[model samples]
Every structure is written in structure tokens, then in C-alpha cells.
Target: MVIATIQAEDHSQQSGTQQETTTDTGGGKNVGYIDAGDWLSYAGTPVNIPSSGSYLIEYRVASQNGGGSLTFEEAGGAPVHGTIAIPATGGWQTWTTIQHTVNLSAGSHQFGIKANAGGWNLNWIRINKTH
Candidate 1:
């Protein structure tokens, strides 16, 4: 099993988002103030899928009122691989881990996270090889 962790504040490119200090573990910044049209691009730091199989994609997030949804797709919005619904953790700094499993080809690829709906804060994204 292999795992890759990407800090939300470390995005290569982004739009309509901001980063602020977090109370979550590691004490770094989190991407917040995300709106429905906000997005983060990882083109400069592409994830290398070790094999063509299922991978567990995890997002460390927090929400106050829930109803947040996001899409994980290839950079530029084509080939959307997964969609996740975020639940309200009760506070802006209240943290939780949300995840979805998706199939990916073996190769290096740029990925992007697009906010389908807003009201959540994202700390990091973790990709774990499941098989």
C-alpha cells in the first residue's frame, strides 16, 4: 500500500479560495472561504498512481452547516473521478475525514478539486492505494 498526502494550501493553482491557520493536527493552514465556483489545481504536483486499480481518496475537512459537495477530477474538469458530500462537524475548526474510492490509471496525472457547493474548510487530501 502507498499513500500520498497533499496539503490544501499547497495547491499549484487555485481560484476564489483563501488559506488560514487551522486547529487541526499538524497546525498548518487550510483552504477555506470556498464557494460553489472555487477550485484548486494540482498540476505542478501531480499524484503518481502506482497501478491501475481502486484508490481511496480522503479529504480532511470541516463544515459549519454542511450541504457541501466537491468533485475530484482531472485538471480542467474532464474525467471527474469522484464526488464527496461533506457533513457539518459543528464548527469551522471542527475536523473530520471524508473519503471516496475511485479507479485511476497507473501514471502521473494532474488533479483538481472543484467545489460543487460550499461551506466547508479543507485541510488536506490523502490518496491511498487500496489494491
Candidate 2:
């Protein structure tokens, strides 16, 4: 089944005492409510794919406050690729592309997003099978 694309804006900042339990997802904002002084969190969730042969990952990111940067990884893994200095797409409301591609085994995987001096506003997550 084709998974529905998930975006970040849907997520609101969660403020509490303990860390929230957010599993692999596509996109959201402030799911962790980290201090994020210089690091905004990944605005998405894990893409629970069927675990086929290969995988293709695509995401769009932005920072309205221009705090820091955006990043990504392979669920429960490290950064596959990302930007250190989050750029402004056009105005203060543009989320640019920070896409990545990789091959994986047929099983469960996790992806993570870390902010660097953040000010990240996420857009979307798009994953597709290659072969």
C-alpha cells in the first residue's frame, strides 16, 4: 500500500516535564519540546514502510526564526544527510528540499532529525521504492 505523505506543521510543540514518546514518524513540530536553543528537532515521524529491497527518502525543511539547521537519518540510525545552515527558501515562509537516498534491508528501520543551532520548520516526508 502506498503510504500517505506526512508533513510537519501538523505537529504542535509539546511542553511537559518528561520526554514524549514519539516513534518513527513522517513529520511534526516540537514533538520532543527540547530546549532547542540551537537545535530544532525533526519535524516528522518514521516512515513505517513495508521494508522491501530499496528505499528512497525525501523531505523538505525550513526555519521561520532562522535559529539553526535541519537534519535527518535512517530510523534508529544516524544522519544520512542534511544541511548545517538552514537556508531561507524565498521569504521567511519557505521550506526548501533536503532529500536523501539509500538502500536498506527488508525489515524495520528508524530515521532521526537533529537541529544545529536550529530554527527549523519542516514541510514533508516522501519515501518511495526504487527496485
- State TM-scores per candidate: 0.97, 0.50
**Backbone clash count, each prediction separately:** 0, 22
Error of 1 at 129 (Å): 0.4
lDDT for each residue of candidate 2 in 26-102, tens digit (9 for 90 to 100): 32332233235322223354455566566566665544555554445553335354444556554334556665556
User: CA lDDT of each candidate?
Assistant: 0.94, 0.46
Best by TM-score: 1
Question: What's the TM for model 2?
Answer: 0.50
Q: Show pairs that collide, candidate 1.
A: none
TM-score of 1: 0.97
The root-mean-square deviation over C-alpha atoms between each candidate and the true structure, in angstroms, is 0.8, 7.3
